[PDB]
């Protein structure tokens, strides 16, 4: 039962990395794909690529073998790059949501409220806040860990995980839900069944996949690191730990197919 | 942020007067949004920019004098021309039924003479005139608006809209009309782009 | 010379706390592997069921038990 989980993890890894290299390759030639929302889509694509190309095979090997066969500096690199890539893609979704809200409620003053003077400052702010959360307990809140070159602990130190969970999921979840609430309000013409159901289907997936992926993990981890009366098993922990990796393979499917020119550029591969 | 409007209009139809509300390009602004309106002449002597201004536009402002019934079928022919054209067939059209104050004097004197099937049409529901309006004048105005919408509804595509308005000669609230219609055109394109409609 | 919580996938190791030195890795056995150190590669083997070492031929030791991925410990 080792090679079977290995081949399904390799299939998911290969599908995710192929989707993200197709999303990042479909923009690198077309000069028409040079707006700010295309920047905000390729930022999510490069965060999912940086996760899926490096962090995912090591976690798959760690699940097949059952022990981290590499060193200890590799584990401290791997956990930090894991947290960095996951919260960078979450805040990439947050700024995509903000861009679409100020794209559908100020349609004429949009290029005077979004400029590259400040459309590449929110990008650096979310990347810097991601690097603050990731390289937080590299000196700050790390509990003393055993000195094996075989285990590789996650950073479940309480006090840090609550700050990280709050300011890495629950504030971007609030921002995404209220801005997509405004987008759904404006997109109801504001005979009407085809106007309401066409929006409640294409925003339902872009909030449902994100909530269904990240809310199990970000709900299990702080409730288990603060209330140790729940005590989740290893199987449910690996399931909620791998849904967050599944989100970065889901995101190639949704977000270019939630546009017009991205879907044409992606369908141009075949 | 520029927005290249395209003013076709008709000759001696209040077009040059409705320009003065700040072939010759003009510019104006509303809420610090800068529209740049391209005049063309009236689609009778200058079809030169029809290749050049075919794609960069965001709307097409077609203004027509409404009082003179003798010069009415040529306007409907030009609207059927531009509404079902080739290069400018995916651009939404703003429609300005100018000189309604002249129509209020030109009615009380008949619209059924120049166009025979006026009495077959009546004043419909969901219509709201201004305060103190004669029903025959509103019936004639909505009759020619319904004629322009009958020409407008002859494509079956839903790829480009049409926004009609009843403007007088010296109305000051007409730049906000083009502002709101350009906002609605760009918002429909934004909702089509994000796969929301 | 001297020989010297309960889970399933939890690893169980033995460390040596020397005078003034830091906690150096000495031995460990788990459900997935069994790792040793260079200092006790031949002079001390391990035994698991309780978990204890078995040395043959630097005086204080610590028997520990921990996880592979979650940040737990039992010293
Ligand atoms: N798989 C998710 C990734 O391991 C992650 C993301 C955010 C965290 O706060 C974390 O501890 C771990």
Ligand 1, residue A79: give the atom nearest the CA: 4
**B94: which strand partners?**
B61, B163
Q: Do B1 and A111 touch (CB under 8 A)?
A: yes
Q: SS3 letters for chain A?
A: CCHHHHHHHHHHHHHHHHHHHHHHHCCCCCCCCCCHHHHHHHHHHHHHHHHHHHHHHHHHHHHHHCCCCCCCHHHHHHHHHHHHHHHHHHHHHHHHHHHHHHHHCCCCCCCCCCCCCCCCCHHHHHHHHHHHHHCHHHCCCCCCCCCCCCCCCCCCCCCHHHHHHHHHHHHHHHHHHHHHHHHHHHCCCCCCHHHHHHHHHHCHHHHHHHHHHHHHHHHHHHHHHHCCCCCCCHHHHHHHHHHHHHHHHHHHHHHHHCCCHHHHHHHCCC
Give chain B's length.
Answer: 197
Give the side-chain half-sphere CA count within 13 A for A132: 10
Distances in Å between the Cα of A77 and the Cα atoms of A13, A72, A82, A158 are: 20, 9, 8, 20
Give the whole-angstrom CA distance, residue B73 versus residue A195.
36
Q: How far apart are CA A15 and CA A10, in angstroms?
A: 8
Task: Give the DSSP H/E element, type plus range, for residue C12.
Answer: strand C11-17
| C-alpha–C-alpha distance, residues A211 and A222, integer Å | 16
**CB nearest to B195's CB, from A107, A111, A258:** A258
CA separation for the pair A96, A103 (Å, rounded) = 10
Distance CA A131, CA A87 (A): 9
The secondary structure of residue C72, as a DSSP letter, is -
The structural domain count of chain C equals 1
C74 in a domain, yes or no? no
Among A149, A184, A163, residue whose Cα is nearest residue A72: A149
Q: What is the CATH number of the domain that holds C51?
A: 2.60.40.10
- Helix A73-104, helix A234-257: angle, nearest 10: 40
CA distance to A210, A245, B131, per residue, from B149 (Å): 45, 54, 24
Question: What residue ranges do the domains of chain A occupy?
Answer: 1-270
Which structural domain range is residue B147 located in?
Answer: 1-197
Q: Which domain holds residue C20?
A: 11-67
* Entry resolution (Å): 3.5
Q: Which of these, B163, B160, B191, lies nearest to B178 by C-alpha position? A: B163
Strand partners, C73: C66
Place of tokens 């009309």: B177
Q: What are phi and psi of B31, to 5 degrees?
A: 55, 40
Tokens of C62: 């610590």
In a domain, C37, yes or no: yes
Residues of A in contact with B33 (CB under 8 A): 108-109
Strand partners, B95: B62, B164
What is the widest separation between alpha-carbon atoms in chain A? 67
Q: Which of residues 65-94 of A touch C (CB under 8 A)?
A: 65-68
Q: With the C-alpha atoms ordered A231, A236, A242, A244, is the resulting torsion angle positive or negative?
A: negative
Among A47, A50, A59, A83, the mutation site with the greatest number of ligand 1 atoms within 8 A of its Cβ is A83
What are B157's two structure tokens?
């595509």
Instruction: For residues C18 and C61, give the distance between their C-alpha atoms in angstroms, rounded to a whole number.
Output: 8
The two structure tokens encoding residue A216: 């199990």
Q: What is the DSSP letter of C26?
A: E
In a domain, C60, yes or no: yes
Contacts of B22 (CB under 8 A, 6+ apart): B28
Q: Are B34 and B2 in contact (CB under 8 A)?
A: yes
C-alpha dihedral (B149, B153, B158, B162), degrees to nearest 10: -20
Torsion of CA A117, A120, A121, A122, to 10 degrees: 130
Tell me the C-alpha to C-alpha distance, in Å, between residue B52 and each of B4, B32, B76: 12, 27, 24
In degrees to the nearest 10, what's the CA dihedral of A58, A63, A67, A69? -30
Give the 3-state secondary structure of residue C20.
coil
CB within 8 Å of C42: residues ≥ 6 apart: none
Residue of C nearest to A156 (CA): C71
Size of interface A-C (CB pairs under 8 A): 63
User: Dihedral of the CA atoms B18, B24, B28, B33 (nearest 10)?
Assistant: 130
Q: How far is it, in rounded angstroms, from Cα C7 to Cα C10?
A: 6
- Residue in the block written with tokens 């939404």: B92
> What are the two backbone dihedrals, phi and then psi, of residue A216, each rounded to the nearest 5 degrees?
-55, -50
Task: Count up the domains in chain B and report the number.
Answer: 1
3-state secondary structure chain B: CCCEEEECCCCCCCHHHHHCCCCCEEEEEECCEEEEEEECCCCCCCCCHHHHCCCCCCCEEEEEECCCCCCCHHHHHHHHHHHCCCCCCCCCEEEEEECHHHHHHHHCCCHHHHCCCCCCCCCCCCCCCCCCCCHHHHHHHHHHHHHHHHHHCCCCCCCCCEEEECCCCCCCCCHHHHHHHHHHHHHHHHHHHCCCC
Measured by CA distance, the residue closest to atom 11 of ligand 1 is A155
Q: Which residues from chain C sit within 8 angstroms of residue A67, using beta carbons?
A: 30, 32-33, 68
User: Would you state the structure tokens that stand for residue B144, as one six-digit string?
Assistant: 């020619």
How distant, in Å, are the alpha carbons of A5, A20, A77, A190, B129 from that of A13? 12, 11, 20, 42, 64
Neighbours of chain C (3+ CB pairs under 8 A): A
Does ligand 1 have an atom closer than 6 angstroms to the CB of A48?
A: no
Select from A10, A26, A16 the least CA-distant residue to A48: A16
Q: Is A82 in the pocket of ligand 1 (CB under 6 A)?
A: yes
Length of chain A: 270
- CB-based contact C66:C75 (threshold 8 Å): no
CB A157 within 8 A of CB A143: yes
């Amino acid at each position: 039962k080792a090679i079977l989980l290995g081949v399904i993890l390799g299939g998911l890894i290969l599908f995710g990395v192929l989707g993200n290299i197709l999303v990042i390759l479909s923009v690198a030639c077309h000069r028409h794909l040079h707006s700010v929302t295309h920047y905000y889509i390729v930022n999510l694509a490069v965060a999912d690529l940086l996760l899926t190309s490096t962090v995912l095979p090591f976690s798959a090997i760690f699940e097949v073998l059952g022990y981290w066969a590499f060193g200890r500096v590799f584990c401290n690199i791997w956990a930090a790059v894991d947290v960095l890539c996951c919260t960078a893609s979450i805040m990439g979704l947050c700024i995509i949501s903000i861009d679409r809200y100020i794209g559908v409620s100020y349609p004429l003053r949009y290029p005077t409220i979004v400029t590259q003077r400040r459309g590449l400052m929110a990008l650096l702010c979310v990347w810097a806040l991601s690097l603050v959360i990731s390289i937080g307990p590299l000196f700050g809140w790390r509990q003393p860990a055993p000195e094996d070159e075989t285990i590789c602990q996650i950073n479940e130190e309480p006090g840090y995980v609550l700050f990280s969970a709050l300011g890495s999921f629950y504030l971007p979840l609030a921002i995404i839900l209220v801005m997509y609430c405004r987008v759904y309000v404006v997109a109801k013409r504001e005979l009407k069944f085809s106007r309401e159901k066409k929006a409640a289907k294409t925003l339902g997936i872009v909030v449902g996949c994100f909530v269904l992926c990240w809310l199990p993990f970000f709900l299990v981890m702080p409730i288990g690191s603060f209330f140790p009366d729940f005590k989740p098993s290893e199987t449910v922990f690996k399931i909620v730990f791998w849904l967050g990796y599944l989100n970065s393979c889901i995101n190639p499917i949704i977000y270019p197919c939630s546009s017009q020119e991205f879907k044409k550029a992606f369908q141009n591969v075949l | 942020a520029t927005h290249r409007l395209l003013l076709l209009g008709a000759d001696n139809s209040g077009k040059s007067t409705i320009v003065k509300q700040m072939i010759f390009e003009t510019k104006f602004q509303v809420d610090k949004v800068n529209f740049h309106m391209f005049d063309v002449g009236g689609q009778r002597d200058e079809r030169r920019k029809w290749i050049q201004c075919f794609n960069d536009v965001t709307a097409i402002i077609f203004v027509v004098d409404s009082s003179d019934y003798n010069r009415l079928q040529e306007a409907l022919n030009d609207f059927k021309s531009i509404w079902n054209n080739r290069w400018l067939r995916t651009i939404s059209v703003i429609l300005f039924l100018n000189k309604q104050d002249l129509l209020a004097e030109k009615v009380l004197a008949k619209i059924e003479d120049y166009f025979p099937e006026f009495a077959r049409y009546t004043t419909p529901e969901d219509a709201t005139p201004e305060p103190g309006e004669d029903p025959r004048v509103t019936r004639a105005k909505y009759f020619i608006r319904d004629e322009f919408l009958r020409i407008s509804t002859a494509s079956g595509d839903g790829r480009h809209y049409c926004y009609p308005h009843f403007t007088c000669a010296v109305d000051t609230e007409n730049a906000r009309r083009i502002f709101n219609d350009c906002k609605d055109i760009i918002l429909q394109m934004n909702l089509r782009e994000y796969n929301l409609v | 010379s001297l020989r010297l919580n309960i889970s399933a996938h939890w690893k169980m190791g033995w460390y040596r706390q020397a005078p003034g030195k830091e906690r150096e890795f000495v031995a460990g056995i788990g459900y997935a592997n069994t790792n040793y150190a260079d200092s006790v590669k031949g002079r001390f083997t391990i035994s698991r069921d309780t978990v204890y070492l078995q040395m043959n031929s630097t005086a204080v030791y610590y028997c520990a038990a921990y996880s592979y991925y979650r940040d737990h410990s039992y010293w």
